[PDB]
Amino acid sequence: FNILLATDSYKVTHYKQYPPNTSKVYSYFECREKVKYEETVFYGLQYILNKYLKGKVVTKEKIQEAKDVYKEHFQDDVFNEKGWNYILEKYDGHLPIEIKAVPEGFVIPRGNVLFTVENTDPECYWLTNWIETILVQSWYPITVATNSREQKKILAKYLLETSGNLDGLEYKLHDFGYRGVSSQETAGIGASAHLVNFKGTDTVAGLALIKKYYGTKDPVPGYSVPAAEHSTITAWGKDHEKDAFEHIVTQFSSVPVSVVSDSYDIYNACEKIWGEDLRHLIVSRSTQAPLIIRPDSGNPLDTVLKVLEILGKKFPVTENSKGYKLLPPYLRVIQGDGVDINTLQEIVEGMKQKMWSIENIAFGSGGGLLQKLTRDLLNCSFKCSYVVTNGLGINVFKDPVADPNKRSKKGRLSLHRTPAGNFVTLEEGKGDLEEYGQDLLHTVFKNGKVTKSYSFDEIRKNAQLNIEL
Amino acid sequence: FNILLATDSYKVTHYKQYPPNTSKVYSYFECREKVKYEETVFYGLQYILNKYLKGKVVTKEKIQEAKDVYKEHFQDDVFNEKGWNYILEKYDGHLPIEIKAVPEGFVIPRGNVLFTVENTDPECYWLTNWIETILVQSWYPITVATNSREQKKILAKYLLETSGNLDGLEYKLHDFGYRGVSSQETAGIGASAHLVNFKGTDTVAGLALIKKYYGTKDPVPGYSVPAAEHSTITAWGKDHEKDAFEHIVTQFSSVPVSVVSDSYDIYNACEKIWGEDLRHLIVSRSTQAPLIIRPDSGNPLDTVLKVLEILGKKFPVTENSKGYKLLPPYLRVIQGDGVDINTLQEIVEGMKQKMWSIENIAFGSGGGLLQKLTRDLLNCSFKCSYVVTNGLGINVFKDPVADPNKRSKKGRLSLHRTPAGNFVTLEEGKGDLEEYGQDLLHTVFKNGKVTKSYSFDEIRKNAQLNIEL
Ligand SMILES: CSc1ccc(CNC(=O)[C@@H]2CCCN(c3ncnc4nn(-c5ccc(C)cc5)cc34)C2)cc1
Ligand SMILES: CSc1ccc(CNC(=O)[C@@H]2CCCN(c3ncnc4nn(-c5ccc(C)cc5)cc34)C2)cc1
Ligand SMILES: NC(=O)c1cccnc1
Ligand SMILES: NC(=O)c1cccnc1
Ligand SMILES: [Cl-]
Ligand SMILES: [Cl-]
Ligand SMILES: [Cl-]
Ligand code: NA
């Protein structure tokens, strides 16, 4: 990895564009104000600091490689070789940057400063926004963690209403997204962001990322169970679906097992194969190791409701203390097709209307959880708010006439708790007046060193729901 | 990277689920039949084969690491240590897999086999679908390349209609997506997929990936120009926007320069600052080095039309041979906000209705180009179609009752030309009848080696538009 080749091309040319006599560029990240996504989980900067920004990130070889690439890419010599060589020679290739950030896992309303970046050497005024591109990719773990948390709020509301408690909430949304994301690196980052809120994942890449960059007291941060796929059912031949089911449940008789049941006819599988032919292998199972029937096609809500109606007629259903129907404890359902925050809401509301407890179900989400998200969802943005030119600080901002939502903050910023316990971003260096308590931004990176780190356990505690609290 | 930890968790348990005495699992990838996206660019498998699948990918240390993680992740011992040890011992950790694929850059209608995977050793029946997760991530470069090519078809239609030629087509959609994708790895993959169709990118990560995995005769596959961002304009102070513009155009007097003009008032900037105050610095520029004015906010079509109306009144507009208005050659526009395939269509049709040539404009697209895409767009899917159990080949498939779109192909597959020169996928080994000539798939991977490969130049030739041919 070469940090000189890890920026948007145009940023190579910006050192020639800033006002002459500029010694400081100070920039900030927010999820701009515009499911409403009123608050965001701050997560993932520590990964970026450690993997890409810390230590000796400039060498003679990286400077020459960048110079050679940019000569061809621009068909001109515009690269700031002198400025990068300055960092190599003066700081042994360590970036003269200070980053201050809200603690990871903090849940912050939209339109607040989450982190700030500034150069610590006047010669490196251009470096603050060089690293915008790398740092703005924090949008992704923020957005995954935030959208996963918003789904946890929906599950918590319906579980509480239909059962009176939150037991097993942290296992109710399982990551099925490894195949559906755009890269191996995205898989690890996204899976780790989902694990801020939940414990169930098949995206194995998330485990190694958490171990390397964050750390847990427990051996692993996420868990799974044996489960079939269409290949392990259909390989038996269509006439032998029952033989596949029997073999699989028997192989994993003492742990929970998920069995995809829609290869040919989900309704037949539930009513006749599970319901009658193999019923003796289901009713013998323990509470700790239930059979989890997995539909994977059709309208998500209609299919869940029809599967529950079938199973409720073939198995001994109880009524819990809230008046909701509960399958026996050896039998559960997972809906792992077509699940995103919108369809999750539709399914749990549909179940509540048909008097089915959310205790009966869990959800698998792949593309909806890890891929169907953009930087525009929370309006994640990085902008310069302060410069020093000719030794004088000036408050800098954009305010496009056709879009007031794109207006940016002015001056030096700080994040504070309000008297009512909410959050406020003070602009124009007004934090210096000390009318609002301590600034919540902490130095996390300075002059090539990570200065403050968070464990994954601390991040999970910070990101808890109020209902859990 | 550890390929043993690079699969969906449930696949760790599948070796125990296939029928006893299964010697072969044969699987295939397609963009299932369901802007219509009727044809897909096959691109990106070669990256995956080289980076993740070739050579010694199993070691004693990688087996022990996977064993230790899966013991905690499943809270049980289910990991196939013996199976992975067999590959390490017998094949020096090279995967006993054969992959056959359509040549990269090929443009193939939906619902055709694009690649097949099978084990070459009967002991490794379980390995075919272990690597589904890694291989299915090819959805991403396929989908970026396909959606980029569909935008090229729109630009080609309107450029031809308004100008009579395709001059500059390959520069008309520029990648601005580096900050808006989910990881560094995704940035390189997605940028490379856009460069199958276009030559303009700010996502520098794409260049290294292409050089390393594909190659080009030219020194670089993609190009950019100096350009401003809001920080380099706003840092001057709101009252000094003219000074910023003047400094920037003067710094890049002899190459094209893009200047974001919407920091405070895009209409004022065009009419008064560019139009009057700095007009003398614009009219003096060469055809090879125009000023490119960049709006970045407001309704994308309405803002482009108003910017063009303003500039047409301040600069000497001509009428081209098709009767469309053309700014002088020293002045162009780039719309780099809110561009996706839908808004691109809306803008070029709106320009045509107002008699503005598409010669006047280029587009920048970021999240729309590289991030706002999912595996569901082209229904990218990997399924088992053939197994050998007890020495007998079985044609296997899924056919869910509630969704006929999810039905999968049966048996051994091959790709052929029809008598009319179209594509057909033959099922159930019917390719062997030689009624449709030779299979168009080539072996690209066998027993740990990449056996056939494509330069980036060949991929570009394969992905050309008919209108270009
Ligand atoms: C489906 S509904 C269920 C399932 C299994 C069970 C068996 N019990 C377990 O697995 C342990 C112990 C008790 C708490 N607990 C869970 N509680 C509620 N719900 C859960 N769900 N899960 C889940 C597991 C695997 C996946 C892939 C997805 C979700 C796990 C859930 C995790 C009980 C209920
Ligand atoms: C805006 S419209 C233009 C712009 C610049 C120019 C100056 N000319 C160039 O740059 C070379 C030589 C001639 C062909 N040629 C281009 N032709 C049409 N169109 C283009 N567009 N571009 C483009 C450049 C940079 C970006 C970031 C995006 C698009 C580049 C374009 C690339 C002419 C027309
Ligand atoms: N465990 C599962 O059922 C699963 C995992 C990943 C994708 N789809 C299903
Ligand atoms: N070159 C540009 O104008 C640019 C690049 C990346 C993102 N936004 C704008
Ligand atoms: Cl060095
Ligand atoms: Cl599956
Ligand atoms: Cl910009
Ligand atoms: Na070894």
What is the 3-class SS of A209-242, one letter each residue? HHHHHCCCCCCCCCECCCECCHHHHHCCCHHHHH
In this structure, are residues B412 and B26 in contact, taking their beta carbons and an 8 Å threshold? yes
Instruction: Report CA torsion sign: B364, B368, B371, B374.
Output: negative
The type of residue at A208 is A
Ligand 3 pocket check: which of A175, A225, A229, A371 to mutate, most ligand atoms within 8 Å of Cβ? Answer: A229
Cα dihedral across residues A278, A283, A285, A288: positive or negative:
positive
3-state secondary structure at position B257: strand
Q: Is B362 in the pocket of ligand 2 (CB under 6 A)?
A: yes
A286, A251 in Cβ contact below 8 A?
no
Helices (H) then strands (E): counts for chain B: 16, 18
Cα(B396)–Cα(B412) distance, integer angstroms: 10
Tell me, using a 6 A CB cutoff, whether residue B252 lines ligand 2. Answer: no
Burial grade of A390 (CB within 10 A; 0-12, 13-18, 19 or more): exposed
Q: How was this structure determined?
A: X-ray
- Confirm or deny that B399 is annotated as ligand binding: no
**Which DSSP symbol is given to A102?**
P
**Measured CA distances, B78 to A172, A256, B23, B223, B299 (Å):** 23, 13, 21, 50, 56
> Ligand 6 centre and the CA of B21: distance in Å?
22
In angstroms, the Cα distances linking A206 to A448, B315, B319, B334, B344 are 26, 56, 58, 39, 36
Nearest to B152 by CA among B205, B97, B195, B93: B195
Pocket of ligand 4 (CB under 6 A): A 8, 10; B 176, 202, 227, 258, 336, 364, 366
DSSP B324-357: -EE--TTEEEEE-SS-SHHHHHHHHHHHHHTTB-
DSSP, res A389: E
Q: Cα(A221)–Cα(A200) distance, rounded to whole angstroms?
A: 9
Find the A347 Cα to ligand 1 centroid distance in Å. Answer: 18
Q: Do B228 and A17 touch (CB under 8 A)?
A: yes
Cα(B3)–Cα(B12) distance, integer angstroms: 12
Answer positive or negative: Cα dihedral of B230, B231, B232, B233: positive
Per the CB < 8 A criterion, the answer to whether A261 and A249 are in contact is no
Decide: A387 and B238 in contact? Cβ < 8 Å: no
- Could you tell me where the DSSP H helices lie in A315-430? 341-353, 367-370
Provide the token pair at B120.
């070459």
Token pair listed for B294:
């960049």
Identify residues whose C-beta is under 5 A from ligand 7, the ion.
B 229
| Count of CB atoms situated within 10 Å of the CB of B186 | 30
B182–A140 C-beta distance less than 8 A:
yes
| Residues near ligand 5 ion, CB 5 Å cutoff | A 59-60
Residue type at B9 in one-letter notation: S
* CB of A227 shorter than 6 A to ligand 3: yes
| CA gap A164, A182 in Å, rounded | 39
Interface of A with B in 203-242 (CB under 8 A): 203-205, 207-208, 218-220, 222-232, 234-238, 240
Residues 81-120 of B with CB under 8 A from A: none
Residues ≥6 apart with Cβ < 8 Å to A462: A103, A104, A105, A106, A107, A454
Annotated binding-site ranges of A for beta-nicotinamide D-ribonucleotide? 202, 294-296, 336-337, 367, 375
Terminal CA-CA length for chain B: 42
Judging contacts by C-beta atoms under 8 Å, the chain B residues touching residue A373 are: 182
Please tell me what DSSP assigns to residue B103: P
- C-alpha–C-alpha distance, residues A211 and A437, integer Å: 34
Amino acid identity at A251: Q
Q: Which of B231, B234, B343 to mutate: most A Cβ within 10 Å?
A: B231
Residue B303: list chain A partners with CB under 8 A. 402
Alpha-carbon distance of B332 to B355, in angstroms, equals 16
Alpha-carbon distance of B173 to B201, in angstroms, equals 9
* Cα torsion angle, A183, A184, A189, A195, sign: positive
Q: At which residue do the structure tokens 């003070």 appear?
A: A426
User: Which of B72, B186, B262 is opposite residue A185, by nearest beta carbon?
Assistant: B186
Mark the breaks in chain B: residue after which each occurs, C to N over 2.5 Å: 34
Contact A182/B178, CB-based, under 8 Å? no
- CA dist., res. A306 & res. A104, Å (int): 42
Report in angstroms the alpha-carbon separations of B424 from A132, B27, B35, B435.
47, 18, 23, 12
Q: What is the domain partition of chain B in residue ranges?
A: 1-136+375-453, 137-374+454-469
Q: Which ligand is nearest to the CA of A224?
A: 1
Place of tokens 């963009």: B31
A336 lines ligand 1 (CB under 6 A): no
Ligand 1 pocket, residue A332 CB under 6 Å: yes
Strands, E, within A16-151: which ranges? 22-31, 39-41, 97-101, 107-109, 115-119
Instruction: Find the closest chain A residue to B3 by CA distance.
Output: A205
Strand order in the sheet with A291-294: A173-175, A361-365, A331-335, A291-294, A257-260
Give residue for tokens 């902008």. Answer: A383
Q: Say how far residue A105 (Cα) sits from the centre of its chain.
A: 11
Query: Is B457 annotated as a binding-site member?
Result: no
Are the C-beta atoms of B377 and B191 separated by less than 8 Å?
A: no
Note the ligand closest to the C-alpha atom of B177.
4
A317 touches chain B (CB under 8 A): no
- Show Cβ contacts of residue A66 under 8 Å, excluding neighbours closer than 6 positions: A2, A4, A5, A79, A84
What span, in angstroms and rounded, lies between the C-alpha atoms of B305 and B350?
Answer: 8
**Cα–Cα nearest to A95, from A9, A32, A10, A6:** A6
Report CA torsion sign: B15, B20, B26, B27.
negative
B178 in reach of chain A (CB within 8 A): yes
- Residue B23 near residue B389, CB atoms below 8 Å: yes
Q: CB of B364 within 8 Å of any CB in chain A?
A: no
**Is the distance from the beta carbon of residue B168 to the nearest atom of ligand 2 less than 6 Å?**
yes
- Residue B181's nearest CA partner among A185, A440, A102, A216 is A185
For residues A29 and A134, is the Cβ–Cβ distance under 8 A? no
Q: Report the run of H or E that residue B228 belongs to, with start and end.
A: none
Take residue B390 and report the two structure tokens written for it: 């007890």
Query: Is there a contact between B81 and B439 (Cβ–Cβ < 8 Å)?
Result: no
